Design a protein around this ligand. Structure first.
Ligand SMILES: [Mg+2]
Ligand SMILES: [Mg+2]
Ligand SMILES: [Mg+2]
Ligand SMILES: [Mg+2]
Ligand SMILES: [Mg+2]
Ligand SMILES: [Mg+2]
Ligand SMILES: [Mg+2]
Ligand SMILES: [Mg+2]
Length: 129
RNA sequence: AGUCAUAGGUAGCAGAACGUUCUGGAACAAUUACGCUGAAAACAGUAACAGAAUUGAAGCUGCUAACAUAAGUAACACUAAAUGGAUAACAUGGCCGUAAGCCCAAGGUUUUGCAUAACAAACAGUGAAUACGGUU
């Protein structure tokens, strides 16, 4: 969530009726998705059905970004931790990695950055001796 | 789901998995896929459970095919010699002349003739009549 706004506007879930890779996804829809819907009231969860394709998990973000994740052969615990990563993020991918100082700010230097002029008056008295 | 303990490795040994082709379980792509990302890796994004393997390739001066490099480089020097706005019929000059001329043999087997581009090989051509060579 950025500035209080939740940033994950919609989640799209695609599955299969007969496919064996969608056993965990059908179990997740049947027993675990009402808890996800109750715990996340800002979310919008769609339910699309693809009768011959592997289960997918498409996350739609409020900055216009979209990220498709495939969840074939996954238990409902692994699907829930995938949605935990999708919900708690802004959607940046595998390639982004953030600034290495781990710090980012407008206005770093209160009192002004050190320059050539900050301690000019003291250094001439230092050179006086 | 909180604390601890362990995690360098060649040869070797052990354990867990990914992927390719085919088959059984009635049929998992007629009208495709395409939010561009996910995962520790092999990878994934058109089942799953089992099974059968000509099942995984930068690495054998391996084989096959294609494409580069050297490189527009080397070569286009055995000879008589060419010129006139043409590989000219005409003119000028030169070279061989016991050959670079003429007639045959062996061998080749149509390589032989025709169009100031062309639509032309699809068309022509080898005649024993001097007691020519053979066949005897
Ligand atoms: Mg070790
Ligand atoms: Mg150690
Ligand atoms: Mg079958
Ligand atoms: Mg399928
Ligand atoms: Mg083999
Ligand atoms: Mg040249
Ligand atoms: Mg001439
Ligand atoms: Mg002859």
């Amino acid at each position: 969530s950025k500035y209080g706004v939740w940033m994950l506007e919609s989640l799209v879930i695609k599955y299969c009726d007969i496919g064996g890779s969608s056993r965990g996804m059908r179990l997740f829809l049947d027993e675990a998705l009402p808890a996800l819907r109750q715990q996340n009231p800002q979310l919008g969860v769609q339910q699309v059905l693809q009768r011959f394709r592997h289960p997918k998990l498409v996350a739609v973000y409020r900055n216009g970004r979209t990220k498709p994740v495939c969840v074939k052969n996954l238990a409902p615990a692994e699907i829930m931790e995938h949605i935990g990563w999708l919900r708690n993020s802004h959607g940046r991918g595998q390639e982004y990695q953030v600034v290495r100082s781990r710090h980012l700010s407008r206005s770093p230097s209160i009192q002004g950055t050190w320059s050539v002029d900050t301690f000019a008056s003291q250094l001439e008295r230092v050179n006086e001796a």
